Amino acid sequence: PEYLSLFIDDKLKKGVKGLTEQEVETILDKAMVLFRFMQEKDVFERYYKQHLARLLTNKSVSDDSEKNMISKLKTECGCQFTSKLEGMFRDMSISNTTMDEFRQHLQATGVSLGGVDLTVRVLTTGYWPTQSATPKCNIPPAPRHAFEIFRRFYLAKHSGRQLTLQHHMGSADLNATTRKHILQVSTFQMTILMLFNNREKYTFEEIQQETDIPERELVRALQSLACGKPTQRVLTKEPKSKEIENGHIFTVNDQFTSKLHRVKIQTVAAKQGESKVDDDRKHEIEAAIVRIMKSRKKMQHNVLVAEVTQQLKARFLPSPVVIKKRIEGLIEREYLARTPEDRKVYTYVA
Amino acid sequence: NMQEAQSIDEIYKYDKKQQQEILAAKPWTKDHHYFKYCKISALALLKMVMHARSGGNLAVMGLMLGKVDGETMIIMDSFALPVEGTETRVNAQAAAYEYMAAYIENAKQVGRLENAIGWYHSHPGYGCWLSGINVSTQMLNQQFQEPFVAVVIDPTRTISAGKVNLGAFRTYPKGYKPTIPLNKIEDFGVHCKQYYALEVSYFKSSLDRKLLELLWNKYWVNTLSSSSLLTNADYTTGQVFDLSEKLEQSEAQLGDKLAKATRDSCKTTIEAIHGLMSQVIKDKLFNQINI
């Protein structure tokens, strides 16, 4: 299923070769029928989440083809997961309409700090995947004030929610040095350069002291800003080495080199992707098995789900999805093989 | 008046020749509903109840000893088995059968002349009915051991309500059927059409009655003043209601059931006359003194 999701993402990413919708829809029909003979769509859709997380970047898709394939999938799949993918699409659309509304508001009531372009793309928490609690990297003054005015606007209109700005994902550009070259940075690099600006001769510990830079994912970015840069060579460090522990002093240099005015460091995205639950899962499996054999209480279709979670003392341990999958796979032979048309007799209390 | 064998103790006789003739003739091979009556000894019920309660909520069971007289299964003893079982499922792997034939061999010498007549099982608090696999158990028990009946006991219902939850059941052979209803499936199993219940009654000995009558009574406002003839008002209403259908079926047959219907009505009328007699004797005892 990971391979099928990879193939689907690869085909939909580049629609130039075979822009006709007929060949694409026949490929999708083949994929759908192949998935039909298979089961366990949970890993399939979490892989969808992984590929669409790393949609968050530039679209580079066809959109309407995704809508058609998700509609044809929902026709034969049902709800919940199909509804949350519909939530993905609805969230993206409502985000772009809210962005249009905010732009209209800025045009109507002029704000000087709105001169910088804002492309807020707020998401939802109940449907989108979660990565972690995210760090608290410092924001430069002007972007901080722009996000503050956006927060003030969003707290108006419809209330009852807040915005916890993240820093893992994001795309930004910066004008640098001499002809003015436009560089592409992704959040953390922007703050690093902003700190570099106000004073030269900045060392790594000084940067780490007041930027709240991450620890584990810092490794990918640290070895991406140097140690294998392309011919653009925007920035280099004087302690040229494969590893830089604590006191590698960084220096700002012109390094005009390439004449291109849209030098981008997006290539780091092409290389950063590379590279005890035992007791908990044993306890969960044992609890589910003892619940499924022991209960045997009078149920029709749902009160068994109530009593099984009643028996446990602590919650989030039941996880009704496991009960659902257990009772679904429990129909293989006589026990719990009752008639779907009338789900009345369920061995009653035996 | 103990040396003579009265009509009460006459059932305590094990005639080998009569039982052999019954087991050789096998009148049950033709009539499927051949057996209707199940008479049970008191001590068998006592041992069964104490074994069911001794195990608590864990199901216990055993083999019972008895004979067959015409259409009546007469059970004279109960017996416990050394089994390991949970609330709903039991195995009886080897220990039960190592203590089943050995028990029979030991009892052949003490004086127990009876053989296997059926087994009883305790269902802790989920009705008196034949389970989906218990019906097959009685299938293969009856297919080769024809004189046989399955007894089902509910310990929790008996210990809570105050009435013995006892059920004697026998199943029809595979192929004998005479969409499922919604009233005969909750008090029975999903295979209710494959088994039927039998009327259950108990018997005791003359010395048993004598010892019971001298054991302990007190029971002045516990029995002699207990709202008699009124406590079982719902029971009497149900009985007088179903006698209507009994008599209407008897009349349809006339257009035999009628003797059974008359016996059924006589039981209720006699019971309530006994209640009236108790009330009258209470009135003559207490109310009409010191005018």
The pair phi, psi for residue B69, each rounded to 5°, is -125, 105
Answer positive or negative: Cα dihedral of A234, A240, A243, A249.
Answer: negative
Please indicate the experimental technique that yielded this structure.
Answer: cryo-EM
Alpha helices in chain A (DSSP H): 2-13, 21-36, 41-53, 64-77, 81-108, 141-155, 188-198, 204-209, 218-222, 277-294, 303-311, 320-329
The answer to whether the CB of A272 falls within 8 A of the CB of A217 is no
The answer to whether the CB of A72 falls within 8 A of the CB of A32 is yes
Instruction: Note which residues in 318-337 of chain A have CB less than 8 A from chain B.
Output: 334
Breaks (C-N over 2.5 A) in chain B follow: 178, 255
Q: In units of Å, what resolution does this entry have?
A: 3.9
Count other Cβ atoms within 10 Å, centred on residue A19: 9
How far apart, in whole angstroms, are the C-alpha atoms of residue A203 and residue A207? Answer: 7
The answer to whether the CB of A211 falls within 8 A of the CB of A192 is yes
Element (DSSP H or E) covering residue A176: strand A172-176
How far apart, in whole angstroms, are the C-alpha atoms of residue B227 and residue B278? Answer: 10
Q: What is the DSSP letter of A140?
A: P
Q: What is the DSSP letter of B53?
A: H
In angstroms, what CA-CA distances link A148 with A118, A141, A329, B231? 12, 10, 52, 79
Q: Where are the beta strands (DSSP E) in B18-165?
A: 37-41, 61-69, 72-77, 115-122, 150-153
In angstroms, what CA-CA distances link B257 with A169, B28, B198? 87, 22, 17
At A91 the three-state DSSP class reads helix
Residue B30 token pair:
């033709």
In angstroms, what CA-CA distances link B264 with A101, A273, B240, B261, B278? 86, 86, 9, 5, 22
How far apart, in whole angstroms, are the C-alpha atoms of residue A156 and residue A150? Answer: 10
The answer to whether the CB of A233 falls within 8 A of the CB of A255 is yes
Measured between CA atoms, the residue of chain A closest to residue B123 is A350
Contacts of A350 in chain B (CB under 8 A): 88, 126, 131-132
Contacts of A345 in chain B (CB under 8 A): 185, 190
The pair phi, psi for residue B197, each rounded to 5°, is -95, 160
Q: How many residues does chain A have?
A: 350
How far apart, in whole angstroms, are the C-alpha atoms of residue B279 and residue B267? Answer: 19
Closest CA to A123 of A99, A102, A141, A143: A99
The answer to whether the CB of A168 falls within 8 A of the CB of A131 is yes
How far apart, in whole angstroms, are the C-alpha atoms of residue A253 and residue A231? Answer: 16
At a CB cut-off of 8 Å and minimum separation 6, what does B197 contact?
A: B167, B168, B169
Residue B132 touches partner A, C-beta closer than 8 Å: yes
Instruction: Note which residues in 55-74 of chain B have CB less than 8 A from chain A.
Output: none
End-to-end CA distance of chain A: 40
Residue A210 touches partner B, C-beta closer than 8 Å: no
Distance, CA of A88 to chain centre: 11
Alpha helices in A63-80 (DSSP H): 64-77
DSSP secondary structure, B128-166, as one string: S---TTHHHHHHHHHHH--S--EEEE-HHHHHHHSS--E
Alpha helices in A156-254 (DSSP H): 188-198, 204-209, 218-222
**Residue indicated by tokens 């048993």:** B208
**Residue indicated by tokens 């009852």:** A160
**Residue indicated by tokens 């009435």:** B163
**Residue indicated by tokens 């059927």:** B177
How far apart, in whole angstroms, are the C-alpha atoms of residue A52 and residue B223? Answer: 81
The answer to whether the CB of A51 falls within 8 A of the CB of A9 is yes
How far apart, in whole angstroms, are the C-alpha atoms of residue A73 and residue A308? Answer: 32
Considering only CB atoms, A296 lies closest to which of B88, B132, B186, namely B88
At A174 the three-state DSSP class reads strand
Contacts of B127 in chain A (CB under 8 A): 349
Closest CA to A194 of A136, A134, A138: A138
Contact B185 A345 (CB under 8 A): yes
The answer to whether the CB of B181 falls within 8 A of the CB of B62 is no
How far apart, in whole angstroms, are the C-alpha atoms of residue A183 and residue A193? Answer: 11
How far apart, in whole angstroms, are the C-alpha atoms of residue A63 and residue A21? Answer: 12
How far apart, in whole angstroms, are the C-alpha atoms of residue A48 and residue A42? Answer: 10
Residue B249 token pair:
């079926």
- Environment class of residue B171 by beta-carbon count within 10 Å: exposed (0-12), middle (13-18) or buried (19+)? buried
Contact A294 B190 (CB under 8 A): no
**Angle between helix A320-329 and A303-311 (nearest 10):** 120
In angstroms, what CA-CA distances link A135 with A187, A209, A230, B66, B152? 12, 14, 29, 81, 67
How far apart, in whole angstroms, are the C-alpha atoms of residue B214 and residue B212? Answer: 5
In a mutational test of the A interface, the residue from B58, B88, B123, B135 whose CB has the highest number of chain A CBs within 10 Å is B88
Closest CA to B137 of B185, B89, B76, B70: B89
